[PDB]
Amino acid sequence: ELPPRKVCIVGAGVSGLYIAMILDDLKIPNLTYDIFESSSRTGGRLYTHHFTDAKHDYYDIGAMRYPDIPSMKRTFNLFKRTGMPLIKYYLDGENTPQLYNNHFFAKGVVDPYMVSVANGGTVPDDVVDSVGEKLQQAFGYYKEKLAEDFDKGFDELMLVDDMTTREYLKRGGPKGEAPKYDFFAIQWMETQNTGTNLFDQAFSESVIDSFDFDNPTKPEWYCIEGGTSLLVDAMKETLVHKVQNNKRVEAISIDLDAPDDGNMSVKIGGKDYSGYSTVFNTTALGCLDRMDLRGLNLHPTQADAIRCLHYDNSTKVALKFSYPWWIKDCGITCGGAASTDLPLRTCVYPSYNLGDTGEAVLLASYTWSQDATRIGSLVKDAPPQPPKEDELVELILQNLARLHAEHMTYEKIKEAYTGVYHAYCWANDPNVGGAFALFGPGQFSNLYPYLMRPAAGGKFHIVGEASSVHHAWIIGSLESAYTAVYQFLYKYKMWDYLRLLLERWQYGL
Amino acid sequence: ELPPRKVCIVGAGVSGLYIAMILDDLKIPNLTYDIFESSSRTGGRLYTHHFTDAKHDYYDIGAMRYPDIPSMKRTFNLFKRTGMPLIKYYLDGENTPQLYNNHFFAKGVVDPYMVSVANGGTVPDDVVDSVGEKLQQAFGYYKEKLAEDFDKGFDELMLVDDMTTREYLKRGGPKGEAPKYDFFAIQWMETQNTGTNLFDQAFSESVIDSFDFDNPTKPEWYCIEGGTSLLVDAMKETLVHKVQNNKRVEAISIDLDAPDDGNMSVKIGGKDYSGYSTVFNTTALGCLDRMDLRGLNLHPTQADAIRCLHYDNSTKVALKFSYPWWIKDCGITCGGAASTDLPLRTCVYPSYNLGDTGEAVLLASYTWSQDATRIGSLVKDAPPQPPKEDELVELILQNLARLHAEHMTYEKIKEAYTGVYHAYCWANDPNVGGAFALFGPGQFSNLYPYLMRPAAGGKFHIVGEASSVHHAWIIGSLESAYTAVYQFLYKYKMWDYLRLLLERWQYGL
Ligand SMILES: Cc1cc2nc3c(=O)[nH]c(=O)nc-3n(C[C@H](O)[C@H](O)[C@H](O)COP(=O)(O)OP(=O)(O)OC[C@H]3O[C@@H](n4cnc5c(N)ncnc54)[C@H](O)[C@@H]3O)c2cc1C
Ligand SMILES: Cc1cc2nc3c(=O)[nH]c(=O)nc-3n(C[C@H](O)[C@H](O)[C@H](O)COP(=O)(O)OP(=O)(O)OC[C@H]3O[C@@H](n4cnc5c(N)ncnc54)[C@H](O)[C@@H]3O)c2cc1C
């Protein structure tokens, strides 16, 4: 029979909970685990903010929307296994405004935003109306390969991973045989396609982003009615060993001079927790880098990956209104999102309140990168009280009025605002230190393989979305967790249970 | 005689104060100004934190150190004009530790850090010990041109501005005739030379950074004894019209239908302030982007520059100790700085406390870019109180013990720590939204010229360090301010006073 063994799961986000879910399902004799979570809260970047207990009065600060595409099958299987109430999420709605250079988009008009050279701007005339087509030409080949087989497509994409998106567009691809674009053409493509400055990160990441958001299969999207935190609730409920919150791991070690399976330990608040046969670290890499890892003897390049792999920032701001004025007054009855060059950048109309006539939540601002850092500078842990003006609220109200100026006035939007809002900047969260991995040029092809290198003789695993090829998605966390469990069972040669893992979990259970 | 005119200065940092200082010196008949500052505090990124009123018990959160090089002459002239108490600043000290891959640097040893291929790492053997030489070969030609004439050198540098530092090193320069470096070679150069990920920004910015920090003239450095805020005090004192604090400009406009000189206005807290013949905006670009600028009719590309020009992040953490253990125990008696791959990254030993035997301040962490964002995630407006652990303090104490392990133990460093510290993350400051401009590839050569474009018929100026070719220095703010004043006098044809400006201010007064 199997000897008694214990493993340590660092962090209680979806990766850590999924590891525990797999172990609980396999029911390996005499195997137990501790799950330590630094926060008082469980679920990590799955985080629903409830303004009240009212059915729809919430927004998702973390994960919100799921495209139903083959590479995401494991995520949807988790949704099914846990009985999640899925409803349609509308990525594109009806009547959503798009506002750039203070002009609204109009179909069938040349340069509606008046940013082209012909109109006194610097965007090349042959670019301004063509961003979709030109980026399709840039990304399209690789998206098609990714759609056939994600892993094979990814390996082929790695052959160009040395370039930033800007570099690829500037030079016409790796041999110069694709179209070459000037600075202002690329700037406009970035402005239309993504967050400020993000074309200065990996071309491969832009490709994958486009694969996920504009997938060749033209997928249905879903969200969880009641918020994504319902998944965390469901996952917690089934745990054989409950999450231990307020436990922040500060060091991880292995004693190589000890013959035992159980020769690993972690330190929490100066105290040693020992006897572990494997440690799965599930935290964002910023949190991992702060730990004292000397006791693991990590490869220097693996250590570099932990410090240097790039993370994007993201900020969300949600406001409550006495009625859904966007639905009633503006005819935006189907969800979707408005985009603009104004500071808010993106206004997302909830897909879960469409029938409500009373109080309603609007995700008024959703930003990334430098845009998110700038909104984030206004987001305080203790928002300013009414004896003072809230600069962030006034900014959002003013931007919303401009974006909605076709049907709304600032006065009306402000009058409908209830005075209740919430905002969150992920780079300001001490338990994450960023929104999610978005790698720089060369990182996937050079550093990532060392991040994923076996460590501590095969007993230490760096697990999570960053530790996968699908960054910024639940799927990345789940695939990473599944793969680490595979490696743990293999290491200890538990062949019955590895066979069972494959039988039950290969597509997810 | 000159008609009555009024101008508006937005923001009370060094740029805005300098504009007012110039106007006050010229004494133009019937000319007045308002200076509006959003903060309750004056001086912006000149900010000294005093722990107590004790002579040396402070650190500079903003500007701290000044190299005495020709391109900085205007800064030193300001120091002289205001009677600043300058003392030597030691960029390099004695006995400062350097720690990477958990090894201390040793002179005359091959790969002391054990990161080269020969030692089981990935840094090429021909790179690891040669970073200085290889970066000198990369930057050297341009540094020499900048040293001859900064403006001419800058114009020549613009011819390669399309490249990131990484790209320049990867491709062997613009025609491929310089050495070409692989990913891990570039990674190590970045690790040794700058903040995490910064080689993914403009090659030109890396050049200028190297020009400023390792200048061919091998300059003396200075700091202001008593802190940089003494300069703000001195500048405020002389103002003919005092700073109006707690006034946050939310919009700027010109009425083109009005024949008057005085046809510009700003909005503060919903209220109009009008009658201005020119407006000098001195704020960081993030703050400018949040204003409603429609009333200025800015060129679309000028608007893009405001949104898109890249800013770096920077974080500082200063701790007080009961005695200067670095001086007494470690022999670091001369200032300087320690560098490491640990989260703190840089530990700066003050140049102003060298003779003190009592309580003393250490700037324990000084970081940029992603390193600064990560430390910054632990920096709270209301730091956690002792009923709770302060994660940031424990991190700094642990890193300091590792960096100082040659002479110190964690226990001793912790015992000497008084429990008093202060930290600041500039990207979290709502009145800045970043530390300072650090442009991405192509930005200086493409967007910057539109940022600097005449606006509102020559009556609106975007002024500040970002609005110059020396980012991240007081000199950039002063040159920008001087140039905007020149343009204002020219616009209104005040030839006597323009001639006087040149006579008195061309090198600074
Ligand atoms: C703004 C935003 C929007 C997103 N939108 C979507 C979406 O629409 N769809 C989608 O599929 N995905 C989305 N995601 C991604 C998804 O939320 C994440 O990929 C996933 O939740 C990450 O889970 P994880 O377990 O890998 O990491 P985490 O959620 O970060 O879990 C790690 C846990 O470790 C804990 N921890 C940190 N340090 C320590 C320590 N020292 N000791 C112990 N514990 C520690 C943390 O508190 C945390 O709970 C979004 C992410 C963000 C940031
Ligand atoms: C971490 C750090 C270290 C540095 N170290 C050095 C150094 O060693 N040596 C050196 O020479 N330089 C250094 N600098 C640079 C120097 O501090 C800055 O370049 C300079 O102080 C910027 O001055 P400014 O007037 O251009 O901008 P700011 O200092 O940002 O002044 C702008 C002012 O506008 C105000 N404002 C913002 N929005 C509004 C609004 N809407 N309405 C009204 N007012 C508004 C702000 O509150 C601020 O006071 C450092 C900078 C940083 C961030």
Side-chain angles (χ1 to χ4, degrees), chain A residues 10-16 36-39 43-46 61-66 247-249 282-284 287 291 314 316 366 426 431-432 435-436 464-465 472-475 477:
Chain A
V10 186
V14 77
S15 288
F36 296 116
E37 163 62 47
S38 55
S39 183
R45 284 168 275 175
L46 303 194
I61 302 175
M64 71 176 185
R65 52 195 177 176
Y66 317 95
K247 293 274 196 300
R248 181 173 55 77
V249 171
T282 77
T283 75
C287 306
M291 300 178 193
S314 191
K316 294 185 180 179
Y366 186 4
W426 281 101
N431 295 304
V432 196
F436 38 64
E465 58 90 22
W473 297 99
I474 292 183
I475 183 56
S477 296

Short mmCIF file of all heavy atoms in Angstrom, two decimals, chain A residues 10-16 36-39 43-46 61-66 247-249 282-284 287 291 314 316 366 426 431-432 435-436 464-465 472-475 477, ligand 1:
data_model
loop_
_atom_site.label_atom_id
_atom_site.label_comp_id
_atom_site.label_asym_id
_atom_site.label_seq_id
_atom_site.Cartn_x
_atom_site.Cartn_y
_atom_site.Cartn_z
N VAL A 10 0.38 26.11 -2.54
CA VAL A 10 0.52 27.52 -2.19
C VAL A 10 -0.41 28.35 -3.05
O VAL A 10 -0.23 28.49 -4.26
CB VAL A 10 1.94 28.04 -2.37
CG1 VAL A 10 2.03 29.47 -1.84
CG2 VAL A 10 2.98 27.13 -1.68
N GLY A 11 -1.41 28.93 -2.39
CA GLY A 11 -2.38 29.81 -3.00
C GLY A 11 -3.68 29.10 -3.31
O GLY A 11 -3.71 27.94 -3.76
N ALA A 12 -4.76 29.81 -3.03
CA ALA A 12 -6.15 29.34 -3.17
C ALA A 12 -6.95 29.93 -4.30
O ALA A 12 -8.13 30.24 -4.10
CB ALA A 12 -6.92 29.27 -1.83
N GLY A 13 -6.28 30.38 -5.37
CA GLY A 13 -7.00 30.74 -6.58
C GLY A 13 -7.50 29.50 -7.32
O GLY A 13 -7.50 28.39 -6.78
N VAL A 14 -7.93 29.68 -8.56
CA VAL A 14 -8.52 28.56 -9.31
C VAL A 14 -7.53 27.40 -9.59
O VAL A 14 -7.93 26.23 -9.61
CB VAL A 14 -9.25 29.04 -10.59
CG1 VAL A 14 -8.28 29.39 -11.71
CG2 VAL A 14 -10.27 27.97 -11.05
N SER A 15 -6.25 27.73 -9.78
CA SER A 15 -5.21 26.70 -9.98
C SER A 15 -5.09 25.80 -8.77
O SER A 15 -5.07 24.58 -8.88
CB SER A 15 -3.84 27.35 -10.24
OG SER A 15 -3.78 27.94 -11.51
N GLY A 16 -4.97 26.43 -7.59
CA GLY A 16 -4.81 25.67 -6.36
C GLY A 16 -6.04 24.85 -6.01
O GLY A 16 -5.93 23.66 -5.63
N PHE A 36 -2.45 26.67 1.56
CA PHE A 36 -2.22 27.92 2.27
C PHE A 36 -2.54 29.12 1.38
O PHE A 36 -2.03 29.21 0.27
CB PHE A 36 -0.77 28.00 2.71
CG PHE A 36 -0.38 26.95 3.69
CD1 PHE A 36 0.57 26.00 3.37
CD2 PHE A 36 -0.97 26.91 4.95
CE1 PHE A 36 0.94 25.03 4.28
CE2 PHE A 36 -0.61 25.94 5.86
CZ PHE A 36 0.36 25.01 5.53
N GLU A 37 -3.35 30.04 1.87
CA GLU A 37 -3.71 31.22 1.09
C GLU A 37 -3.36 32.50 1.87
O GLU A 37 -3.81 32.68 3.00
CB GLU A 37 -5.19 31.18 0.72
CG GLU A 37 -5.80 32.51 0.28
CD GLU A 37 -5.17 33.06 -0.98
OE1 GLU A 37 -5.00 32.29 -1.96
OE2 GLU A 37 -4.83 34.27 -0.99
N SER A 38 -2.55 33.38 1.28
CA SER A 38 -2.12 34.59 1.98
C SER A 38 -3.29 35.49 2.35
O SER A 38 -3.30 36.10 3.43
CB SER A 38 -1.09 35.38 1.17
OG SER A 38 -1.60 35.69 -0.11
N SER A 39 -4.27 35.60 1.46
CA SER A 39 -5.41 36.49 1.68
C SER A 39 -6.42 35.95 2.69
O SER A 39 -6.48 34.75 2.96
CB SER A 39 -6.12 36.78 0.36
OG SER A 39 -7.19 37.69 0.55
N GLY A 43 -9.98 32.49 -3.76
CA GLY A 43 -10.36 32.57 -5.16
C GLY A 43 -9.48 33.43 -6.07
O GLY A 43 -9.58 33.33 -7.30
N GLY A 44 -8.62 34.26 -5.49
CA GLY A 44 -7.66 35.03 -6.26
C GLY A 44 -8.27 35.94 -7.31
O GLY A 44 -9.10 36.78 -7.01
N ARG A 45 -7.89 35.73 -8.57
CA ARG A 45 -8.37 36.54 -9.67
C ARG A 45 -9.76 36.12 -10.17
O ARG A 45 -10.25 36.66 -11.15
CB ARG A 45 -7.33 36.60 -10.80
CG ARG A 45 -6.15 37.54 -10.45
CD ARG A 45 -4.98 37.38 -11.43
NE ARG A 45 -4.07 36.28 -11.07
CZ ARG A 45 -3.04 35.90 -11.82
NH1 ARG A 45 -2.82 36.52 -12.99
NH2 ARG A 45 -2.24 34.90 -11.43
N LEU A 46 -10.38 35.16 -9.48
CA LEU A 46 -11.83 35.00 -9.55
C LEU A 46 -12.43 35.77 -8.38
O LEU A 46 -12.29 35.38 -7.22
CB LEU A 46 -12.21 33.53 -9.42
CG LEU A 46 -11.57 32.58 -10.44
CD1 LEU A 46 -12.32 31.23 -10.40
CD2 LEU A 46 -11.64 33.20 -11.84
N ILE A 61 -14.63 41.56 -10.87
CA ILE A 61 -13.39 42.31 -10.84
C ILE A 61 -12.32 41.55 -11.62
O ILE A 61 -11.48 42.13 -12.31
CB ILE A 61 -12.91 42.50 -9.38
CG1 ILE A 61 -14.00 43.21 -8.55
CG2 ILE A 61 -11.60 43.27 -9.32
CD1 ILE A 61 -13.66 43.33 -7.05
N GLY A 62 -12.34 40.23 -11.47
CA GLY A 62 -11.47 39.32 -12.18
C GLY A 62 -12.19 38.73 -13.39
O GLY A 62 -12.85 39.46 -14.15
N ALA A 63 -12.00 37.43 -13.60
CA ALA A 63 -12.60 36.72 -14.73
C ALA A 63 -14.10 36.96 -14.83
O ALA A 63 -14.81 36.92 -13.83
CB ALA A 63 -12.31 35.22 -14.62
N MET A 64 -14.56 37.20 -16.05
CA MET A 64 -15.97 37.52 -16.33
C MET A 64 -16.64 36.74 -17.48
O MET A 64 -17.85 36.51 -17.44
CB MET A 64 -16.25 39.02 -16.35
CG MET A 64 -15.69 39.75 -17.51
SD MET A 64 -16.23 41.48 -17.41
CE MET A 64 -15.55 42.03 -18.96
N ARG A 65 -15.91 36.58 -18.58
CA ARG A 65 -16.48 36.08 -19.82
C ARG A 65 -15.67 34.93 -20.41
O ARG A 65 -14.45 34.91 -20.31
CB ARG A 65 -16.51 37.22 -20.83
CG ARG A 65 -15.14 37.90 -20.96
CD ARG A 65 -15.27 39.23 -21.67
NE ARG A 65 -13.99 39.94 -21.75
CZ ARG A 65 -13.83 41.09 -22.39
NH1 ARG A 65 -14.86 41.66 -22.99
NH2 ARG A 65 -12.64 41.68 -22.41
N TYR A 66 -16.38 33.94 -20.96
CA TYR A 66 -15.77 32.71 -21.50
C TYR A 66 -16.18 32.40 -22.95
O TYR A 66 -17.37 32.17 -23.21
CB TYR A 66 -16.08 31.56 -20.54
CG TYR A 66 -15.87 32.05 -19.12
CD1 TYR A 66 -16.94 32.53 -18.37
CD2 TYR A 66 -14.59 32.13 -18.58
CE1 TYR A 66 -16.74 33.04 -17.10
CE2 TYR A 66 -14.38 32.64 -17.33
CZ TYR A 66 -15.46 33.09 -16.58
OH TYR A 66 -15.24 33.61 -15.31
N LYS A 247 -2.49 32.83 5.54
CA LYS A 247 -1.20 32.15 5.65
C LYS A 247 -0.34 32.48 4.42
O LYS A 247 -0.49 31.84 3.37
CB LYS A 247 -1.42 30.64 5.70
CG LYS A 247 -2.12 30.14 6.96
CD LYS A 247 -1.11 29.90 8.07
CE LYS A 247 -1.71 29.04 9.18
NZ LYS A 247 -2.90 29.70 9.78
N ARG A 248 0.62 33.37 4.60
CA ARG A 248 1.43 33.83 3.48
C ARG A 248 2.77 33.12 3.51
O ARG A 248 3.57 33.32 4.42
CB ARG A 248 1.65 35.35 3.54
CG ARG A 248 2.48 35.90 2.36
CD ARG A 248 2.55 37.44 2.35
NE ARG A 248 3.04 38.01 3.60
CZ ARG A 248 4.32 38.04 3.99
NH1 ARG A 248 5.27 37.51 3.22
NH2 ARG A 248 4.65 38.59 5.14
N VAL A 249 3.01 32.28 2.51
CA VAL A 249 4.28 31.58 2.42
C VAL A 249 5.41 32.56 2.08
O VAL A 249 5.26 33.39 1.17
CB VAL A 249 4.21 30.44 1.40
CG1 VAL A 249 5.58 29.86 1.15
CG2 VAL A 249 3.23 29.35 1.91
N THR A 282 1.18 28.19 -6.68
CA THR A 282 0.20 28.69 -7.64
C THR A 282 0.10 30.22 -7.80
O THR A 282 -0.80 30.71 -8.47
CB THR A 282 -1.19 28.08 -7.42
OG1 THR A 282 -1.82 28.71 -6.30
CG2 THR A 282 -1.08 26.57 -7.17
N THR A 283 0.97 30.95 -7.11
CA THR A 283 0.85 32.40 -7.02
C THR A 283 1.31 33.07 -8.31
O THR A 283 2.00 32.46 -9.13
CB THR A 283 1.70 32.99 -5.87
OG1 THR A 283 3.09 32.97 -6.25
CG2 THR A 283 1.51 32.19 -4.58
N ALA A 284 0.92 34.33 -8.50
CA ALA A 284 1.52 35.13 -9.56
C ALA A 284 3.03 35.19 -9.32
O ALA A 284 3.50 35.02 -8.19
CB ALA A 284 0.93 36.55 -9.57
N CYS A 287 4.69 37.49 -6.61
CA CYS A 287 4.62 37.00 -5.24
C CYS A 287 5.67 35.92 -5.01
O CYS A 287 6.22 35.80 -3.92
CB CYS A 287 3.24 36.43 -4.94
SG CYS A 287 1.90 37.59 -5.30
N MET A 291 9.57 35.52 -2.28
CA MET A 291 9.88 34.46 -1.31
C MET A 291 11.36 34.17 -1.31
O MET A 291 12.05 34.40 -2.31
CB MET A 291 9.14 33.16 -1.65
CG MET A 291 7.63 33.27 -1.68
SD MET A 291 6.95 31.67 -2.17
CE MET A 291 5.26 32.14 -2.53
N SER A 314 -4.40 45.80 -15.27
CA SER A 314 -5.79 45.98 -15.67
C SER A 314 -6.58 46.64 -14.54
O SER A 314 -6.39 46.32 -13.37
CB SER A 314 -6.43 44.64 -16.04
OG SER A 314 -7.68 44.87 -16.66
N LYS A 316 -10.64 48.00 -13.40
CA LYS A 316 -12.08 48.05 -13.68
C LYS A 316 -12.75 49.04 -12.75
O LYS A 316 -12.32 49.20 -11.61
CB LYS A 316 -12.74 46.67 -13.48
CG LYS A 316 -12.28 45.62 -14.48
CD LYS A 316 -13.08 44.31 -14.29
CE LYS A 316 -12.64 43.24 -15.27
NZ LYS A 316 -13.38 41.96 -15.08
N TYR A 366 -12.97 49.70 -18.32
CA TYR A 366 -12.18 48.48 -18.26
C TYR A 366 -10.93 48.78 -19.07
O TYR A 366 -11.01 49.01 -20.28
CB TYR A 366 -13.01 47.35 -18.89
CG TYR A 366 -12.42 45.94 -18.80
CD1 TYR A 366 -11.24 45.68 -18.11
CD2 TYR A 366 -13.06 44.88 -19.42
CE1 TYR A 366 -10.72 44.38 -18.04
CE2 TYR A 366 -12.55 43.59 -19.37
CZ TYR A 366 -11.39 43.34 -18.68
OH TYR A 366 -10.91 42.05 -18.64
N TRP A 426 -5.49 45.90 -10.49
CA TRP A 426 -4.84 44.64 -10.15
C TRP A 426 -3.35 44.76 -9.81
O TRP A 426 -2.84 44.02 -8.97
CB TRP A 426 -5.08 43.58 -11.23
CG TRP A 426 -6.45 42.97 -11.10
CD1 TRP A 426 -7.57 43.27 -11.85
CD2 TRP A 426 -6.86 41.98 -10.14
NE1 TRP A 426 -8.64 42.52 -11.41
CE2 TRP A 426 -8.23 41.73 -10.37
CE3 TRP A 426 -6.20 41.30 -9.10
CZ2 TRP A 426 -8.95 40.79 -9.62
CZ3 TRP A 426 -6.93 40.38 -8.34
CH2 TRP A 426 -8.28 40.14 -8.60
N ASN A 431 -1.40 40.66 -3.39
CA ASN A 431 -1.43 39.21 -3.59
C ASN A 431 -1.31 38.76 -5.05
O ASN A 431 -1.35 37.57 -5.34
CB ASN A 431 -2.67 38.62 -2.92
CG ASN A 431 -2.64 38.79 -1.42
OD1 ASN A 431 -1.70 38.37 -0.76
ND2 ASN A 431 -3.65 39.46 -0.88
N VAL A 432 -1.17 39.72 -5.96
CA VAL A 432 -0.98 39.45 -7.39
C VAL A 432 0.17 40.28 -7.98
O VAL A 432 1.09 39.74 -8.60
CB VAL A 432 -2.27 39.60 -8.23
CG1 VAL A 432 -2.09 38.92 -9.61
CG2 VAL A 432 -3.47 39.00 -7.49
N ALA A 435 -2.15 42.25 -13.37
CA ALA A 435 -3.36 41.55 -13.78
C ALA A 435 -3.06 40.10 -14.20
O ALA A 435 -3.70 39.16 -13.75
CB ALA A 435 -4.04 42.30 -14.90
N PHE A 436 -2.08 39.93 -15.07
CA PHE A 436 -1.78 38.61 -15.62
C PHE A 436 -0.57 38.70 -16.54
O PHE A 436 -0.16 39.79 -16.95
CB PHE A 436 -2.98 38.03 -16.39
CG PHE A 436 -3.77 39.06 -17.18
CD1 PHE A 436 -3.18 39.74 -18.25
CD2 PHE A 436 -5.09 39.32 -16.87
CE1 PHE A 436 -3.91 40.70 -18.97
CE2 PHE A 436 -5.83 40.28 -17.58
CZ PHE A 436 -5.23 40.96 -18.64
N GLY A 464 0.16 28.01 -12.65
CA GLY A 464 -0.77 29.12 -12.73
C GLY A 464 -0.88 29.59 -14.16
O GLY A 464 -0.23 29.02 -15.05
N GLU A 465 -1.67 30.64 -14.40
CA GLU A 465 -1.88 31.08 -15.78
C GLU A 465 -0.58 31.48 -16.45
O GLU A 465 -0.41 31.25 -17.63
CB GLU A 465 -2.92 32.22 -15.87
CG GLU A 465 -2.58 33.50 -15.06
CD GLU A 465 -1.78 34.54 -15.85
OE1 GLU A 465 -1.81 34.52 -17.09
OE2 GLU A 465 -1.12 35.40 -15.22
N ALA A 472 -3.85 34.96 -19.10
CA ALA A 472 -5.02 35.80 -18.87
C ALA A 472 -6.36 35.07 -19.02
O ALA A 472 -7.39 35.70 -19.17
CB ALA A 472 -4.97 37.07 -19.80
N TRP A 473 -6.35 33.74 -18.92
CA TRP A 473 -7.60 32.98 -18.96
C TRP A 473 -7.62 31.90 -17.88
O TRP A 473 -6.58 31.39 -17.48
CB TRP A 473 -7.82 32.31 -20.33
CG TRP A 473 -7.98 33.27 -21.46
CD1 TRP A 473 -7.01 33.64 -22.34
CD2 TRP A 473 -9.17 33.98 -21.83
NE1 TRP A 473 -7.52 34.54 -23.25
CE2 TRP A 473 -8.84 34.76 -22.96
CE3 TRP A 473 -10.48 34.02 -21.34
CZ2 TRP A 473 -9.77 35.58 -23.59
CZ3 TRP A 473 -11.40 34.84 -21.97
CH2 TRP A 473 -11.04 35.61 -23.08
N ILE A 474 -8.82 31.55 -17.42
CA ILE A 474 -8.95 30.44 -16.50
C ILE A 474 -8.32 29.17 -17.10
O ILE A 474 -7.69 28.41 -16.38
CB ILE A 474 -10.43 30.16 -16.12
CG1 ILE A 474 -10.98 31.31 -15.26
CG2 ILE A 474 -10.53 28.81 -15.38
CD1 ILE A 474 -12.41 31.10 -14.76
N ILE A 475 -8.47 28.97 -18.41
CA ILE A 475 -7.98 27.74 -19.06
C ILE A 475 -6.47 27.56 -18.78
O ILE A 475 -6.01 26.45 -18.53
CB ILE A 475 -8.26 27.73 -20.58
CG1 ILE A 475 -7.80 26.41 -21.23
CG2 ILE A 475 -7.58 28.91 -21.28
CD1 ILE A 475 -8.41 25.16 -20.58
N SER A 477 -4.71 28.53 -16.18
CA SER A 477 -4.56 28.05 -14.80
C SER A 477 -4.89 26.56 -14.68
O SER A 477 -4.18 25.82 -14.00
CB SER A 477 -5.46 28.84 -13.86
OG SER A 477 -5.05 30.20 -13.82
C1 LIG C 1 -8.77 41.88 -14.89
C2 LIG C 1 -8.85 40.40 -15.23
C3 LIG C 1 -9.86 39.93 -16.06
C4 LIG C 1 -9.92 38.58 -16.40
N1 LIG C 1 -10.92 38.13 -17.23
C5 LIG C 1 -10.99 36.78 -17.53
C6 LIG C 1 -12.02 36.31 -18.32
O1 LIG C 1 -12.89 37.08 -18.73
N2 LIG C 1 -12.07 34.96 -18.62
C7 LIG C 1 -11.12 34.08 -18.15
O2 LIG C 1 -11.18 32.87 -18.45
N3 LIG C 1 -10.10 34.54 -17.35
C8 LIG C 1 -10.04 35.89 -17.05
N4 LIG C 1 -9.04 36.34 -16.24
C9 LIG C 1 -8.00 35.36 -15.80
C10 LIG C 1 -8.28 34.52 -14.58
O3 LIG C 1 -8.94 35.35 -13.65
C11 LIG C 1 -6.90 34.10 -14.06
O4 LIG C 1 -6.10 33.56 -15.10
C12 LIG C 1 -7.02 33.02 -13.01
O5 LIG C 1 -8.08 33.37 -12.17
C13 LIG C 1 -5.70 32.94 -12.24
O6 LIG C 1 -5.80 31.89 -11.30
P1 LIG C 1 -4.48 31.35 -10.58
O7 LIG C 1 -4.87 30.32 -9.55
O8 LIG C 1 -3.53 30.85 -11.65
O9 LIG C 1 -3.81 32.64 -9.88
P2 LIG C 1 -4.47 33.52 -8.71
O10 LIG C 1 -5.93 33.79 -8.95
O11 LIG C 1 -3.64 34.79 -8.64
O12 LIG C 1 -4.30 32.64 -7.38
C14 LIG C 1 -3.08 32.68 -6.67
C15 LIG C 1 -3.41 32.73 -5.18
O13 LIG C 1 -2.21 32.74 -4.43
C16 LIG C 1 -2.37 33.63 -3.34
N5 LIG C 1 -1.03 34.05 -2.88
C17 LIG C 1 -0.21 35.04 -3.39
N6 LIG C 1 0.95 35.04 -2.68
C18 LIG C 1 0.87 34.06 -1.74
C19 LIG C 1 1.74 33.63 -0.75
N7 LIG C 1 2.96 34.15 -0.64
N8 LIG C 1 1.36 32.59 0.08
C20 LIG C 1 0.14 31.98 -0.07
N9 LIG C 1 -0.72 32.42 -1.05
C21 LIG C 1 -0.36 33.43 -1.86
C22 LIG C 1 -3.19 34.76 -3.90
O14 LIG C 1 -3.82 35.50 -2.87
C23 LIG C 1 -4.16 34.01 -4.82
O15 LIG C 1 -5.35 33.67 -4.15
C24 LIG C 1 -8.97 37.68 -15.91
C25 LIG C 1 -7.95 38.15 -15.09
C26 LIG C 1 -7.89 39.51 -14.75
C27 LIG C 1 -6.79 40.00 -13.87
#
